[PDB]
């Protein structure tokens, strides 16, 4: 299927959607693959890191054959012409919004579809929303402000529980410290390092970590330095 | 399987913690076979009976990127004695594991459930909302029977699930016959169905007769207290 996606059928569908605050469900071919499904996969992974309240699910509809989930495609008025079709539910299989048929299925667009329609926000992997808010043009604030930002965020660092997020905050703190010490030259250096490392010998978990670092690194970019 | 939700390292805890109870079968990825088919039958049965029970599977089948190996490890299960069946009580921390000696069958899974939760997976055919008001039906006065007939006929008309619609017909038949003839109907209809069931019947016809017998059983009374004809 896709990682962290829950594939639902006519018996599980409503009863599962009805247990979650929000659900985003991709109705598609029973054996989906291709750019759009990969984008929904990436979105499942990002969503799952970003929220506690959002079910990411798929329903595979088989037309001809001994039919699978055709009731569901019928209920939601989606068939071979519409796929993949993205629905967003809010606890009630009868109340939903459907991603406009003209919107490209990309991670970015799926993430905006959720934010446009729920209070949830799915940031970039590695980013910590709290940190971000206090970090814009960190690289242009005075050394003493920077030094202040470092002590506060280092406090939230140890108020955080999830390993992923604890690693993320440590990268933020490292970058604050480097950018405090080296100035903005740091960005390009760290970028080149992370990219050479990503384009080298490393695992599944390895390239994700490096991407999370890059996304965290991006927060510290400014349009002019001063 | 149908109605089983397959969960993985990302979806497991978060899904299990949204349902009051979850029964989870850990097994190889792409499971198959007789225990899997029995878990499948159980999923169908539980879904017909409750809305509070998640039925789920985790495919460990560890030979690759090791999907779900961490999950199997959290619960200390093993290629070595798959399947392992767990019951969770609303989070991924509170669970009971089905003893590895218990054959994984439909009956044992239902028992596991009723043994460990307030949930009840009823007998095939039964409609809980009917059974709730039918206890001792055969002994109550005619006018109460008649009111129950009117009430369950009204319920039947609102039923939206097709298996319950069909089962409800058998309840109404039995209520009306029992009203009309008395408790002797229970022997009459039992002999009729047991005769059929003792014939050469397919598995699907067998199931259909069992559902009628499970419904008729609702009407049996421990002692007949109401006068005959
Ligand atoms: Cs709900």
Swiss-Prot record, chain B:
MF (Gene Ontology): protein homodimerization activity
SUPFAM superfamilies per the UniProt record, alphabetical: ERP29 C domain-like, Thioredoxin-like
Effect upon mutating residue 2 to K: Does not affect subcellular targeting of pip
Subcellular localization, as worded in the UniProt entry: Endoplasmic reticulum lumen
Effect the entry attributes to changing residue 65 to K/Q: Does not affect subcellular targeting of pip
PROSITE patterns, sorted: ER_TARGET
Phenotype for residue 29 to S: Does not affect subcellular targeting of pip
Outcome of swapping residue 192 to A: Affects subcellular targeting of pip
GO process terms (BP): dorsal/ventral axis specification; embryo development ending in birth or egg hatching; maternal specification of dorsal/ventral axis, oocyte, soma encoded; protein folding in endoplasmic reticulum; protein secretion; regulation of multicellular organism growth
Record annotation: effect of changing residue 83 to D: Affects subcellular targeting of pip
Record region (CXXC motif): 1-4
The UniProt record lists the keyword Endoplasmic reticulum: yes
InterPro entries: ERp29, ERp29_C, ERp29_C_sf, ERp29_N, Thioredoxin-like_sf
Assigned keywords, A-Z: Chaperone, Developmental protein, Endoplasmic reticulum, Signal
Gene3D superfamilies referenced in this protein's UniProt entry, alphabetically: Endoplasmic reticulum resident protein 29, C-terminal domain (1.20.1150.12), Glutaredoxin (3.40.30.10)
Pfam family, one: ERp29
Gene Ontology cellular component list: endomembrane system; endoplasmic reticulum; endoplasmic reticulum lumen
Disulfide-linked positions: none
Tissues of expression: Briefly expressed in the follicle cells of the ovary, at around the time when the dorsoventral axis of the egg chamber is first established.
Domain of life per record: Eukaryota
Complex formation: Homodimer. Interacts with pip; the interaction is direct and does not require pip to be folded.
Domain statement: The CXXC motif was initially thought to constitute the active site of a potential protein disulfide isomerase activity. However, such motif is not essential, suggesting that it has no disulfide isomerase activity. Its precise role remains unclear.
General remark: 'Windbeutel' means 'profiteroles' in German.
Protein function: Probable chaperone protein involved in dorsoventral axis patterning in early embryos. Probably acts by folding and targeting pipe (pip) into the Golgi.
Record protein name field: Protein windbeutel
């Amino acid at each position: 299927t896709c990682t962290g996606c829950v594939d639902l059928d006519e018996l599980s569908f409503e009863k599962t959607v009805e247990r979650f605050p929000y659900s985003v469900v991709k109705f598609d071919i029973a054996y989906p693959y291709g750019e759009k499904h990969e984008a929904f996969t990436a979105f499942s992974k990002s969503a799952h890191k970003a929220t506690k309240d959002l079910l990411i699910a798929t329903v595979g509809v088989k037309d001809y054959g001994e039919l699978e989930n055709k009731a569901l495609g019928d209920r939601y008025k989606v068939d071979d012409k519409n796929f993949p079709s993205i629905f967003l539910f809010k606890g009630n299989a009868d109340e939903y919004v459907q991603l406009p048929s003209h919107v490209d299925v990309t991670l970015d667009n799926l993430k905006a579809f959720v934010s446009a329609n729920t209070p949830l926000y799915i940031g970039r992997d590695g980013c910590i929303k709290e940190f971000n808010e206090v970090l814009k043009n960190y690289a242009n604030i005075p050394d003493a402000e920077q030094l202040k930002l470092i002590e506060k965020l280092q406090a939230k660092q140890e108020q955080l529980t999830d390993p992923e997020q604890q690693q993320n905050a440590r990268a933020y703190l490292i970058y604050m410290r480097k950018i405090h010490e080296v100035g903005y030259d740091f960005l390009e250096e760290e970028t080149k390092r992370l990219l050479r490392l990503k384009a080298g010998k490393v695992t599944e978990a390895k390239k994700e970590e490096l991407l999370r670092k890059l996304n965290i690194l991006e927060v510290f970019r400014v349009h002019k330095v001063t």
